[PDB]
Design an enzyme around this catalytic site. Sequence first.
Site, short mmCIF file in Angstrom:
data_model
loop_
_atom_site.label_atom_id
_atom_site.label_comp_id
_atom_site.label_asym_id
_atom_site.label_seq_id
_atom_site.Cartn_x
_atom_site.Cartn_y
_atom_site.Cartn_z
N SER A 181 -11.76 -12.06 -9.42
CA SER A 181 -11.64 -13.38 -8.77
C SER A 181 -12.84 -14.19 -9.19
O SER A 181 -13.85 -13.60 -9.63
CB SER A 181 -11.74 -13.22 -7.25
OG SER A 181 -11.73 -14.49 -6.59
N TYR B 157 -14.70 -9.18 0.76
CA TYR B 157 -13.93 -9.53 -0.45
C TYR B 157 -14.85 -9.87 -1.62
O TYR B 157 -14.69 -9.33 -2.74
CB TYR B 157 -13.00 -10.70 -0.12
CG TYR B 157 -12.07 -11.14 -1.21
CD1 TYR B 157 -12.45 -12.09 -2.13
CD2 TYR B 157 -10.73 -10.67 -1.26
CE1 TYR B 157 -11.56 -12.54 -3.10
CE2 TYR B 157 -9.87 -11.06 -2.24
CZ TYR B 157 -10.27 -12.03 -3.14
OH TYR B 157 -9.38 -12.47 -4.09
#
Lengths: 255, 253, 255, 253
Positions: free
Chosen positions: D138, D151
């Site tokens: 990401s 995350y």
Amino acid sequence: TLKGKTALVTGSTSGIGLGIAQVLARAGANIVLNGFGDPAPALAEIARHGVKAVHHPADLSDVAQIEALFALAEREFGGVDILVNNAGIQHVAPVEQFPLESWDKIIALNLSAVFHGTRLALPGMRARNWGRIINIASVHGLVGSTGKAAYVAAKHGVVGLTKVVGLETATSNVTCNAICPGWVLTPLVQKQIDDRAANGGDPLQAQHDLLAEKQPSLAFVTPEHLGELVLFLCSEAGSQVRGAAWNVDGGWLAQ
Amino acid sequence: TLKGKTALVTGSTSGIGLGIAQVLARAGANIVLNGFGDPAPALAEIARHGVKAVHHPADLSDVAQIEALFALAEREFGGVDILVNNAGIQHVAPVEQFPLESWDKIIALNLSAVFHGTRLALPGMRARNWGRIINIASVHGLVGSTGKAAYVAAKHGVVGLTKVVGLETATSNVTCNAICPGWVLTPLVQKQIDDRAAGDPLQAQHDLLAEKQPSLAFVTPEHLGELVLFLCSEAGSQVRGAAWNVDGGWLAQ
Amino acid sequence: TLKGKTALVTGSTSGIGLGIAQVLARAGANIVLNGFGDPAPALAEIARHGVKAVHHPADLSDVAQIEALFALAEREFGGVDILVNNAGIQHVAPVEQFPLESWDKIIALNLSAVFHGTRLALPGMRARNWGRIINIASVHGLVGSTGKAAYVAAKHGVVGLTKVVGLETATSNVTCNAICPGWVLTPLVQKQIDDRAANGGDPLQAQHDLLAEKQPSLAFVTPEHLGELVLFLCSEAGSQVRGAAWNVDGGWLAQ
Amino acid sequence: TLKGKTALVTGSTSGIGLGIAQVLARAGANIVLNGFGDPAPALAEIARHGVKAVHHPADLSDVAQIEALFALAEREFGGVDILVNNAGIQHVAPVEQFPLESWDKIIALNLSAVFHGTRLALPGMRARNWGRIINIASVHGLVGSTGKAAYVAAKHGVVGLTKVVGLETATSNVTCNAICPGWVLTPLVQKQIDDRAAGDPLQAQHDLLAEKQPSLAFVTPEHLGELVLFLCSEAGSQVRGAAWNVDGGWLAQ
Ligand SMILES: NC(=O)c1ccc[n+]([C@@H]2O[C@H](COP(=O)([O-])OP(=O)(O)OC[C@H]3O[C@@H](n4cnc5c(N)ncnc54)[C@H](O)[C@@H]3O)[C@@H](O)[C@H]2O)c1
Ligand SMILES: NC(=O)c1ccc[n+]([C@@H]2O[C@H](COP(=O)([O-])OP(=O)(O)OC[C@H]3O[C@@H](n4cnc5c(N)ncnc54)[C@H](O)[C@@H]3O)[C@@H](O)[C@H]2O)c1
């Protein structure tokens, strides 16, 4: 400098943690020490600086024990002003042969312990509107090496976590940053060198051999150097250093 | 503490460079000042710290003037022990409307002059077995912003130059590193605030900060001088080729 | 793929530029070639793909000549849809002995030429609401090496410029990105290898010797590989790749 | 083009993983699907491309189930040639309010499962002289956002793991790389849009994008599958240990 402050330094009964603890003690901070061993020598090394210290033996892979360590800090010092998350452990193996228990342990100590220390220290820091969280990461939080899958993952995770915490606390007087050391003269590294000398080899040659591949300066970073940087980050001049990952690495990351 | 050392700070007649110079003087370094405008105020700010200061008016656009700057430092103080490459200018325009003279001037001052200072200072640092080269880059040495083609290019260049010089000097007592500030309230930033206000100037000031800097607080020149001072300490000895950000969270997101 | 498009590739009479040009030609793009030498062979290498080509000898350190090169593209093809800024030149010396003329030349060709190409191509790209600017930077746009002050500065500058242009064009169908190659098999590198073989040494050994320090794969990136990446960035799948600096480097930056 | 190759895409029953799987099938790879929900729709989406697909329901929280996943791939297709470590979950909370079970679950799936997939796939890739491991990280493997402690940690971990594996495999025909997307309109992002709207949902969608992604446009799963396809080509052969962003400008500023 830090008169009136309390610092908790994880893994501070020896090496990097102890070196950082010593610099902070000299600066006037009370110390919460943590780590394996008889802590009487470590406590005495801190107390001789004219500061108060306590110790907790918490294994930081056990969340209950991390809770106990912070509960001790709350009881004896009323909470931590300065938290130094300093960690654990390494294991070398190719990724496909990397032991599952070693992956889990390295993640638990080098990464998750940082989250737990952070969640436990931050409420009191906000309440007092002053705080410093300093995560001792590694050059391996910014680049990889062969054989170090778990450690590189864990240290990169710490660098990421540092950014989120730096952002979450940005509007406050609490900061969170990471220091990313290259090769540091630790007791284990010193043992490797001493083991060479005991065989008859030259200690400086052993150092140059260990550092040649990764660290252009061929010179160690010391725990004292890292303690002095922690001290800087706790100063007023560190007030807008937020979510940073500052490398001290004899040129490792420059190439 | 820097007693017995000589620091040269380019562009130290105002803003960040003056802030850095003040902290180094307070630490005991003799100072070579530089930059445009009346030097007397800057001279008085440094010498209040009980240190010697000289100002040399070199336009760092001009390599011959940079050479005269360093030769004066050599005759006045016996050479530069700590070099802060700080002088810098800004111009904001879309890339396809960016004046060609502005591209050339920004590259010349914000990048090439850092190389020129470095090349002139390093031999004496090596020869005397100690030195510190600190480049004032920016968050814009690590990321971009719209309208800042030349400045971002130059500042990235500085961050790359810093790595080469840090490697090259790694086996010596000379280090070379960059400090990467976020927003600091100086004339350079004021102009951007004004061009945005052209409108409440204080609202423009806040909006300018908030867009980029999560802390909603400016970095101060004094903070940056304290970092230079740290990098000049023994604890800075193995900080080499690094770009350390002081930026209120700018690069964390 | 790129039928109906025109690509201008700087430094494309040989090596990396020519390789990229060839891939784009095969994809159906008309080519504006630039570089030193008789261009008849280079033009013929492009035209045999069933596409139109022209050439301009512009020295990209001379702004007037860069202007002439783009004026030719405008006259013959109505402007550039795809610009590949590919560059120049290297010089190795310690920073304190780095020649002033070589600093200025490396900056002019590796950095400023990118600004000039970009300012000249972008208005027409916006007007047509489609465009790709691809800057061939280097691993040295992201890290340093000893002896390469000007080249590392220039390539880092390109990576920065790429970000600003990527942001400025973000709301449009124009993108700007950089590719950062490690060691590439160029005619000059091939010459070094051939020179070893002419002495009697083994060509693969010469390659492994050249790459061992910096490039873990011990294998070259090829101009064909880079052309294929350019081709990807010009595809619909590249539409939200913006201000990126993608490394193709056999592991150089991973360590 | 991927004819004769077998790809396994974790979490391919929806969103990005399903998009990637579709492009690889279209390219000719047989597919091992995985992830929660009815597999029939995903199976039908892949097999429309005239390729064989199987779904294995392994919960990648559980290492024994990951092992059964890979053993099935071995019995069905003779092993995995292209592994896409895609499955991932999200939870947003300030760090000091972050549920302990969420930290553990995000670390387990978004990081540790990538290591487990990698360790299980690499021996056969080595043994057959070719492989591609592509980790879907990401922008949050490179930068932070508020509320995303676990995350962002996990995604940074993935980007670091990717470097180690890329180095370790550098002298082989196996590569390992990460793709770092910005916002893609999937159920994972929809939940964030909804929690913001709790308020016009389309205004929430725009504001969510605009805060982070300068292009004001989402990245699509198809775009990401086309990049995986590129990394599987011969032109990807020396892309090793890299983290390539497709992010509408997220990391450029
Ligand atoms: N202010 C900020 O928010 C900010 C943020 C990051 C980095 N920086 C950098 O900090 C440095 C100092 O900037 P500042 O904000 O203090 O700006 P400033 O305009 O207040 O000061 C610039 C100084 O440089 C001098 N100068 C300008 N051109 C010169 C030349 N050709 N030769 C010699 N001196 C020259 C000026 O006289 C002045 O002394 C610059 O390199 C700038 O890019 C500023
Ligand atoms: N959507 C975005 O904007 C975005 C941006 C960057 C990265 N990513 C990453 O892309 C990947 C896919 O996310 P998405 O947006 O498509 O989300 P999604 O929720 O639409 O899809 C997630 C997939 O993973 C599966 N899954 C969840 N838990 C699992 C488990 N324990 N075991 C096996 N499968 C499991 C789900 O069934 C589903 O198939 C994730 O790793 C996410 O972090 C998403």
